[PDB]
Amino acid sequence: SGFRKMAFPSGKVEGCMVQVTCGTTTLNGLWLDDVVYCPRHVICTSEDMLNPNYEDLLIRKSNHNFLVQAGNVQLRVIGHSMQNCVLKLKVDTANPKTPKYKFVRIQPGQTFSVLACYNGSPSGVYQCAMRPNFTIKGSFLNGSAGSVGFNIDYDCVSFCYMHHMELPTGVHAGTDLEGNFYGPFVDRQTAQAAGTDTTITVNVLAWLYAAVINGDRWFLNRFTTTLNDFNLVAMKYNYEPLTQDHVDILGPLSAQTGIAVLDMCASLKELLQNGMNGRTILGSALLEDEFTPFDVVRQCS
């Protein structure tokens, strides 16, 4: 028992991480088979970051301009391309450590593990959700661009996120591995703001189920509510609407605990209307929304 924010083991991703340098600009790249993927703003100079014309910059570069370090081993670039906001740097040497992998784009409300790196060297691993407003609330300093987010299924690494940049509010923005940004953002050092965020209701309910599985029962009650009457309360507190498909996804957890989904919603309503009154749930005094139903089933089962 116990419930912690748990990342996937990061070994398979650590062996893919390289350093990429253009002149005095450096960041991380992802080395799979004979291609290194990295954020395209590695070709910007310090003063060309307010509105880079990435087509200029790339046509004026040559292969020998790209320094790729895989630890101590320098890697020879033998081809370069741009794909949306990432570069694909072809290299002569295929990565012997390439795991089986997929490029997937994730949905807001889904979680993934982040391997934060600096100068091609893994620094730490932690768990993130994609927020309804397409930002992530990560932990990233200068040098972290090119760090990737991922999920692991049996032996398959599904890469879903490459880090690019920090917004002024302190949250983070990036692309899928195909170079298309999550959310309405661009890779330029301009004023950009996220839309207003909401709370991921299905996740809060899943975390309430994790709590009940771990012995926290004080917020339970015997009232039930209807789906529409719960959504009226949700909208009032800036939670996203709950759908019938959310109720279905919660089925396994409703079955294991014997607490019907709409019964749990009555508890949630009460917590939103009343607060927690100095008690806690799974070591938190706020409602946590960064565990999916899958994440709960994964730990508690």
């Binding site: 600096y118 661009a145 940049m165 917004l167 050092q189």
Partner: peptide, 8 residues
């Protein structure tokens, strides 16, 4: 005010 998070 966005900061691209390369280094140096």
């Amino acid at each position: 005010a966005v900061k691209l998070q390369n280094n140096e």
